[PDB]
Design a binder for this molecule. Structure first.
Ligand SMILES: [Zn+2]
Length: 469
């Protein structure tokens, strides 16, 4: 019979027999009984009543009302009356954009934010720095702009790529996100993924290479900042001071992914520093590096996060890590619990939205296909009980942009899988089903076309063309 098409699925929908042809908001009340992230939305033939426990729940209730208005706009016969009582399963529901790989203009970020807010995402993570570019301006380090923000080409295409946000643009983004219920999380990836920083400031590295250029290809860089160099710590203190001014979330993602330690092992400065500190290997050195960085953050009231790299011993109890490596989700849940770490689920089997969504679409010679149906199969807890998985804070989907050069390409791969991620982060398992989700997503094609002039239809051949290979 007649249903709503709200994504994410609300925790409770009680449908009634009457029909509503108006969604005029008749009441909008803050009530003490509901939690601050919760709302109750009642649809009657005379209009709608919204109750919420706080500003956060109110934002979510208005987001549901927006989807119901989009449904009603396409249903002249009216929509069912009913009561929706709703609160998210997980408090962290995030997407990550990758302007380091391909710069995202301010106007395009706005559209990306409006779309994620429509699905009740509440975290926007900015991957600001990598091998292919550096997008955060830092006073006192002008070569980040003149060198690190520019590259000669991408994958042999001969086409230079550059870009850097202004401080005013980033403060605009923060306010734009806050008005839509979204906290912004900057990432300064360290100690690796740093070829762009090396191109600008080779003196920060164990083996300075003045001829180094910003990377124009994918693949792994072995260049790690040298923890023995005072300039490194002065630089990151300056970076973190800018983040304190710009990003009121106070959370700084430090990255830490894909940082092989070969060059630390060989570095003549790091070798003797390890001898002085009685460090037996470079994992102990990595632990000390993160601890020193966390101490710098703590001076500003900031807190770190990391990509989980499978060695829980390098993090400090109470810190948050992101599980991402293929095949490691269950082990990561267990090891982070034992180590006293909090966990965000970003498993690349379900959440890496750079991967093609239909078999036969560009995989660049290595990417597996993650279909919409596969994505929807994600339970962030992997069926584990609360005593084993209560340290999981939520779900997070990166849209890595090595191969996504503009917003058109970004949205093509981000959606509709981001809709499934939204439901995995928000909806209790007891209201989730592929059949129901698929039904609603079909209706959402018209909703998103109407509201955003954007088409979420996916076929193998309708991905925008690429210039490479
Ligand atoms: Zn070194």
């Amino acid at each position: 019979t007649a249903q709503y098409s709200i994504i994410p699925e609300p925790s409770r929908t009680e449908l009634r027999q009457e029909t509503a042809k108006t969604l005029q908001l008749l009441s909008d009340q803050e009530v003490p009984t509901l939690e601050t992230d919760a709302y109750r939305l009642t649809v009657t033939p005379q209009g709608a009543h919204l109750a919420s426990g706080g500003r956060e729940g109110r934002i979510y209730g208005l987001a549901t009302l927006r989807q119901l208005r989009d449904q009603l706009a396409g249903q002249p016969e009216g929509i069912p009356c009913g009561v929706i009582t709703d609160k998210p399963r997980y408090p962290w529901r995030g997407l990550m954009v990758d302007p380091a790989r391909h710069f995202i203009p301010a106007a395009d970020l706005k559209k990306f934010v409006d779309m994620m807010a429509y699905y009740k995402f509440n975290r926007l993570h900015l991957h600001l720095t990598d091998n292919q570019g550096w997008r955060l301006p830092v006073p006192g380090y002008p070569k980040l702009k003149s060198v690190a923000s520019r590259r000669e080409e991408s994958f042999g295409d001969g086409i230079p790529h550059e870009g850097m946000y202004t401080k005013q643009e980033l403060k605009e983004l923060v306010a734009y996100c806050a008005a839509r219920g979204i906290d912004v999380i900057p990432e300064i990836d360290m100690p690796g993924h740093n070829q762009a920083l090396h191109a600008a400031y080779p003196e920060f590295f164990c083996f300075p290479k003045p001829d180094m250029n910003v990377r124009t290809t994918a693949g792994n860089s072995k260049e790690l900042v040298c923890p023995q160099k005072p300039e490194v710590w002065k630089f990151y203190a300056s970076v973190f001071n800018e983040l304190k001014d710009i990003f009121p979330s106070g959370i700084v993602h430090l990255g830490g992914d894909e940082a092989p330690t070969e060059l630390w092992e060989k570095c003549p400065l790091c070798r003797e520093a390890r001898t002085r500190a009685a460090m037996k290997d470079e994992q102990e050195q990595m632990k000390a590096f993160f601890a020193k960085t966390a101490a710098l953050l703590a001076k500003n009231g900031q807190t770190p996060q990391f990509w989980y790299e499978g060695n829980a011993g390098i993090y400090h109890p109470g810190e948050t890590v992101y599980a991402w490596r293929q095949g490691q989700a269950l082990q990561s849940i267990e090891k982070t619990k034992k180590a006293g770490l909090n966990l965000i689920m970003a498993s690349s089997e379900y959440c890496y939205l750079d991967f093609p969504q239909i078999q036969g679409q560009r995989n660049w010679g290595w990417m597996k296909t993650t279909t919409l149906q596969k994505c929807y199969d994600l339970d962030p807890a992997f069926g584990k009980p609360e005593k084993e998985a209560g340290h999981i804070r939520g779900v997070h989907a990166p849209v890595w942009a090595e191969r996504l050069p503009d917003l058109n390409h970004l949205l093509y791969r981000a959606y509709p899988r981001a809709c499934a991620i939204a439901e995995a982060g928000w909806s209790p398992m007891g209201v989730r089903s592929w059949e129901n989700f698929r039904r609603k997503l079909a209706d959402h094609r018209q909703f998103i076309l109407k509201r955003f002039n954007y088409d979420m239809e996916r076929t193998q051949g309708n991905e925008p063309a690429f210039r490479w290979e």
